[PDB]
Design a protein around this ligand. Structure first.
Ligand SMILES: *[C@@H]1O[C@H](CO)[C@@H](O[C@@H]2O[C@H](CO)[C@@H](O[C@@H]3O[C@H](CO[C@H]4O[C@H](CO)[C@@H](O)[C@H](O)[C@@H]4O)[C@@H](O)[C@H](O[C@H]4O[C@H](CO)[C@@H](O)[C@H](O)[C@@H]4O)[C@@H]3O)[C@H](O)[C@H]2NC(C)=O)[C@H](O)[C@H]1NC(C)=O
Ligand SMILES: *[C@@H]1O[C@H](CO)[C@@H](O[C@@H]2O[C@H](CO)[C@@H](O[C@@H]3O[C@H](CO)[C@@H](O)[C@H](O)[C@@H]3O)[C@H](O)[C@H]2NC(C)=O)[C@H](O)[C@H]1NC(C)=O
Ligand SMILES: *[C@@H]1O[C@H](CO)[C@@H](O)[C@H](O)[C@H]1NC(C)=O
Ligand SMILES: *[C@@H]1O[C@H](CO)[C@@H](O)[C@H](O)[C@H]1NC(C)=O
Ligand SMILES: *[C@@H]1O[C@H](CO)[C@@H](O)[C@H](O)[C@H]1NC(C)=O
Lengths: 49, 596
């Protein structure tokens, strides 16, 4: 969980498994992911101001 | 963390990636379907290839996760499916040969043709004229010759390909841990790991045999009645107590008996429900039909279609230089996108097809928030049953009277209701024994109990013994009769429809019981029954996260498929057939042969 008034943006290597994934490897993903705001898309991928 | 957390994170990442990739592939395929261009073809091929490569690599990476350290009972099933579905066990040459055989079978079935003798100047394919000839022409000799020529030109050239394909499938099964390819096919319904709900692959054969034995009296009465009716049309070509020819079923493959309804109508003088005339007179177009279908879906409690569905589902073909396939299909692209692709006309059959597609779309809309791997039904027949029950409920005259297309002064009595029941029987039950026979034959050919040099002989014996239809002209081992069918050509499971009929009839009876419906079973509706809708939605959201037995019990309270709803739905029809068959012999004679 984050803290109030936070600007966390990072496509860094997420510690998903138990191993110290400082580099890369299996079960090693990234927390921040692209959205893909598409006008055709409805619930879950719609922009809101 | 632990192994469970690692598996959960891997499954979540795979689901998130696969949702987008499958959405891209489905979008490219939809663009090709609604706009047939070379660029669309290239894009669809590239998207499909990338999706297949992603599935293969994900399945290969998933092999590092053991299945004996999972207590969720949902992550384990997803991991097992990933390991068994996207991965390959056969060698490269074997897979290439199997793909080549599949491509050759598809090409030969798509462009199959046969034409008049000693005149190769002009010929026509099976789809344009042969189906029309089988469904309209009344000439016994010409129909028999066309059937014989099609069988000779299909099975003789498909026998080596079918043999090679079945040998490769047997090799794949041997590499697997299942009994055979038929065992692998039956394993789709297998449920393991749960006490009190375990299932076995071999139980399906016994269950189908039991259902066929239970349905035997109705089917034999129907066959006797059809033979008696045809005795007044082709007395010399059909034995009075023997077996009907295979080419007098109204179609090339003899799957459905609907085409013979007009020829052998029990009562041609009774008025018929012609909603097409009222639809044409009152300007009922595709827009109005779709709006009425949406209203019916809202009345049964299902949520209305949103703007995405309406702007993503084509209604009428643009035409002109634009060409699109008129095969009715419903699209499940994920990401909250669902489309319907069909050529719609102002007919009752097209109305039923539209209701079918809308029911399928609503079923696909019932697991929007569920994981991508769980975005599917436990059994392949559940999806079709859900798609068909809405059409069955709409097809009843009560909804037609409520809308107003049917005349409010229309009456219902014994004759009209019997005719409707017989039409429904010829549409549905007319293929169920054929479905069982062909599924059993495929089971034997996959297992290999029947010798290959005796395949045709055993096929003829099964046709003469269980089907009750004698062959007008015999074929030796050089021919491959079942290869002429689409299901056999594409090697698809031929038990989906048999289970689907029972599932949909059980669902219909359960919803009619929950709606407190009164009167005969075949006149029932759930238009203003929200409890039935809630009961259905209870099963809809389960998906693959729950066993199919529990899902079926949550609606009908039965632990297995039962044909008793099917028999009860047609009880007046059975009584009418029994009354009509007093002077008609019932049964099939194996000794008799039309070819001397
Ligand atoms: C493991 O991986 C495989 C693929 O490698 C996945 O298999 C696919 O599963 C889906 C759904 O289970 C299949 O989609 C359905 O296929 C049925 C097969 O029919 C074939 O023949 C008809 C012509 O008669 C074709 O039109 C059709 O495209 C098929 O080629 C269809 O009958 C189904 O259509 C029904 O539903 C739609 C709505 O979706 C309605 O519009 C239709 O009218 C009809 O009622 C449906 O299309 C898909 O075909 C399977 N692929 C293959 C190659 O067989 C597994 O899902 C996957 N398992 C996992 C991930 O767990
Ligand atoms: C098997 O794995 C799945 C996937 O993680 C587990 O599902 C998860 O279950 C928890 C609750 O046990 C869900 O937490 C939810 O939190 C919200 C608040 O944000 C709360 O309102 C909900 O009532 C719920 O508690 C979590 O969302 C859910 N995750 C998914 C993807 O469905 C499941 O519990 C595991 N089963 C076992 C037996 O461990
Ligand atoms: C189909 O695709 C072509 C080329 O991509 C495009 O010009 C056309 O507008 C599209 N739609 C129709 C109906 O042709
Ligand atoms: C869906 O259809 C229309 C949309 O306005 C409305 O009349 C109806 O009440 C809606 N029902 C639901 C359940 O959303
Ligand atoms: C005719 O209708 C009556 C209802 O009073 C029913 O009892 C009878 O079985 C029907 N006859 C046939 C042949 O279905």
């Amino acid at each position: 969980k984050l803290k109030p008034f936070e600007r966390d943006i990072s496509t860094e290597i997420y510690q998903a498994g138990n191993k110290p994934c400082k580099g890369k490897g299996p079960n090693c993903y990234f927390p921040l992911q692209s959205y893909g705001f598409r006008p055709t898309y409805g619930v879950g991928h719609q922009p809101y101001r | 963390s632990t192994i469970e957390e690692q598996a959960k994170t891997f499954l979540d990442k795979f689901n998130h990636e696969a949702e987008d990739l499958f959405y891209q592939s489905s979008l490219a395929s939809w663009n090709y379907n609604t706009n047939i261009t070379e660029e669309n073809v290239q894009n669809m091929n590239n998207a499909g290839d990338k999706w297949s490569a992603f599935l293969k690599e994900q399945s290969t990476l998933a092999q590092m996760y053991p299945l004996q350290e999972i207590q969720n009972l949902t992550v384990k099933l997803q991991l097992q499916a990933l390991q068994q579905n996207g991965s390959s066990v056969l060698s490269e040459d074997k897979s290439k040969r199997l793909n080549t055989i599949l491509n050759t079978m598809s090409t030969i079935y798509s462009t199959g043709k046969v034409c008049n003798p000693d005149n190769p100047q002009e010929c026509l394919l099976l789809e344009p004229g042969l189906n029309e000839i089988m469904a309209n022409s009344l000439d016994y000799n010409e129909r028999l010759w066309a059937w014989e020529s099609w069988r000779s030109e299909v099975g003789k050239q498909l026998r080596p390909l079918y043999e090679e394909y079945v040998v490769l499938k047997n090799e794949m099964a041997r590499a697997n841990h299942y009994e055979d390819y038929g065992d692998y096919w039956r394993g789709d319904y297998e449920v393991n790991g749960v006490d009190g709900y375990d299932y076995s692959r071999g139980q399906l054969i016994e269950d189908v045999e039991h259902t066929f034995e239970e349905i035997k009296p109705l089917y034999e009465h129907l066959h006797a009645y059809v033979r008696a009716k045809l005795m007044n049309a082709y007395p010399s070509y059909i034995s009075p107590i023997g077996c009907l020819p295979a080419h007098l079923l109204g179609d090339m493959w003899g799957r459905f008996w609907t085409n013979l309804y007009s020829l052998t109508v029990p009562f041609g003088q009774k008025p018929n429900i012609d909603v097409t005339d009222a639809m044409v007179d009152q300007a009922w177009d595709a827009q109005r039909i779709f709006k009425e279908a949406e209203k019916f879906f809202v009345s049964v409690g299902l949520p209305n279609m949103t703007q995405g569905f309406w702007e993503n589902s084509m209604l009428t073909d643009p035409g002109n230089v634009q060409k699109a396939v008129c095969h009715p299909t419903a699209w499940d692209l994920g990401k909250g996108d669902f489309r319907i692709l069909m050529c719609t006309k102002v007919t009752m059959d097209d109305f039923l097809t539209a209701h079918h597609e809308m029911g399928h779309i609503q079923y696909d809309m019932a697991y929007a928030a569920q994981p991508f791997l769980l975005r599917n039904g436990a059994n392949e027949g559940f999806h079709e049953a859900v798609g068909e029950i809405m059409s069955l409920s709409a097809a009843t005259p009560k909804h037609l009277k409520s809308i107003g297309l049917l005349s409010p002064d229309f009456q219902e009595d014994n004759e009209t209701e019997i005719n409707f029941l017989l039409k429904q029987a010829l549409t549905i039950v007319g293929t169920l024994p054929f479905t069982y026979m062909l599924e059993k034959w495929r089971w034997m050919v996959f297992k290999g109990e029947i010798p290959k040099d005796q395949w045709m002989k055993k096929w003829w014996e099964m046709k003469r013994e269980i089907v009750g239809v004698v062959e007008p002209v015999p074929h030796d081992e050089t021919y491959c009769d079942p290869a002429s069918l689409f299901h056999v050509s594409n090697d698809y499971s031929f038990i989906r429809y048999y289970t689907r009929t029972l599932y949909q009839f059980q669902f219909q009876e359960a919803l009619c019981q929950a709606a407190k419906h009164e009167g005969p079973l075949h006149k029932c509706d759930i238009s203003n029954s929200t409890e039935a809708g809630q009961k259905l939605f209870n099963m809809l959201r389960l998906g693959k996260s729950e066993p199919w037995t529990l899902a079926l019990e949550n609606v009908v309270g039965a632990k297995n498929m039962n044909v008793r709803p099917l028999l009860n739905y047609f009880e007046p029809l059975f009584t009418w057939l029994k009354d009509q068959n007093k002077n008609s012999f019932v049964g099939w004679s194996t000794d008799w042969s039309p070819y001397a």
